[PDB]
Amino acid sequence: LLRCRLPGGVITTKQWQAIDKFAGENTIYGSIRLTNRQTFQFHGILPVHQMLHSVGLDALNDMNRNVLCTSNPYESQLHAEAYEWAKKISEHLLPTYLPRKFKTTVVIPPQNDIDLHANDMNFVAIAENGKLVGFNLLVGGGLSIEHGNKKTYARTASEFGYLPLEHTLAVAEAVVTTQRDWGNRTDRKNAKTKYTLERVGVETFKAEVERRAGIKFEPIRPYEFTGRGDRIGWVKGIDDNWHLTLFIENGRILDYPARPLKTGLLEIAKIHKGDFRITANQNLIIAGVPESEKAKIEKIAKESGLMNAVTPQRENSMACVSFPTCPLAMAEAERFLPSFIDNIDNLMAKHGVSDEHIVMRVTGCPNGCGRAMLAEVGLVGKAPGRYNLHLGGNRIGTRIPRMYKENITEPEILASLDELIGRWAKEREAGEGFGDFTVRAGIIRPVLDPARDLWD
Ligand code: SRM
Ligand code: SF4
Ligand SMILES: [K+]
Secondary structure, three states, X not given: OEEOEOHHHEEEHHHHHHHHHHHHHHEOOOOEEEXXXXXXXXXXXXXXXXXXXXXXXXXXXXXXXXXXXXXXXXXXXXXXHHHHHHHHHHHHOOOOOOOOOEOXXXXXXXXXXXXXXXXXXXXXXXXXXXXXXXXXXXXXXXXXXXXXXXXXXXXXXXXXXXXXXXXXXXXXXXXXXXXXXXXXOOOOOOOOHHHHHHHHOHHHHHHHHHHHHOOOOEOOOOOOOXXXXXXXXXXXXXXXXXXXXXXXXXXXXXXXXXXXXXXXXHHHHHHOXXXXXXXXXXXXXXXXXXXXXXXXXXXXXXXXXXXXXXXXXXHOEEEOOOOOXXXXXXXXXXXXXXXXXXXXXXXXXXXXXXXXXXXXXXXXXXXXXXXXXXXXXXXXEEEOOEEEEEEOOOOOOOOOOEEEEEEXXXXXXXXXXXXXXXHHHHHOOOOOOHHHHHHHOOOOOOOOOHHHHOOO
């Protein structure tokens, strides 16, 4: 169980070659697993740190987790600055004992690929003339719950206000320390920032942060999100550069018969001029490809099976690791997803909505690593082959889905979705997402204030 610290998911080809060798020669599984926090994991290590240190990498007493940063912004020029900040915040937070783990992100609107609402502290980038001027601060998200425990809940992050770029580190430090001091001491299931906020009140927490940071928050600056998915395929970057995002099912990199994904990426790493970017959706970006090099890269990716076409549905689906390695797993997630989506693909076709997508996620237990508590349709593992079915989130990930059915099997889940997708296909307004539709049509009540109305 080794996971590397890699702010913003940026990894060089020199580092990639080193981790590729290790994975193949020194682990039981022989795979590289991309995580939804923009980093990677080895499974079944039979020296790991010596290998990491040799290529300038380190593995994380420390309660901090990998700092995320939007991987492929529409305004491509903004990535460099945003990434510099994610790296500075990461280094700033490097070892104070936090009550529970603390998660941070740097977001570039209109993309919410990093799923800000699942994190403790989020810096939403505000730019003026292609340059960052400051950040809107949102605090308090977290998705972990305990089955049947109405004292636990998934919570979205709350807006605090805007801060100029110069106050970033002082503000980051103030949020961390306030949480460290005010976090619950008796209980660990109630130590997370989301619980502290609900206990003391957002304004109380905000006031202490301003006091500690020595600033006063300005009113929030306008921002909107349009989606959370990756931009699969080729997109034009800045200058004569291009970015190729490869869809990797479950982020599982291994050589399969007829699809040598691992060898393919190694061959690309050997000729690639730039670096790679691991996304929050468990995919990989071959970044900074000069136009002249496009054909060489695509040839390898094509031959290796890395560019095999899948439906928009599959591109917007996700699952956590779960079995066989997770010791806390209740139901299959990663190993269940491929065939489950084969079934969903058929239902979408049956109803004439094959070009559409529903943000669908499977998490193996309520800890919520697969981020099902921010999905339009979320499945939460309860027992072998059984899940709680949640409905009602939205495409952008700003609403928690309420439990619709409890402890049901795949056939029961499919039967319910066949009916609902059928209704959505016929009764939806123009451009209306599935989650919003279930709420509008009265199929499920929305969750308007999680700490108080998540549980029926
Ligand atoms: C690999 C990954 C899932 C994936 O398929 O991508 C994952 C895998 C594990 N997570 Fe996580 N978590 C992953 C993202 C998250 C997320 C989502 C996110 O951060 O974007 C969450 C939900 C958001 C949240 O924290 O509220 C999440 C909430 C947890 C929790 C519940 C924490 C809590 O506040 O209660 C645990 C259990 C714990 O810490 O006690 C945990 C525990 C674990 C462990 C380490 C199990 C353990 O403690 O022994 C899992 C290892 C499985 C394995 O064999 O590899 N993981 N986990 C993600 C690794 C990210 C990373 O590089 O750090
Ligand atoms: S949600 Fe549960 S089963 Fe899935 S990786 Fe996290 S801890 Fe393991
Ligand atoms: K993926």
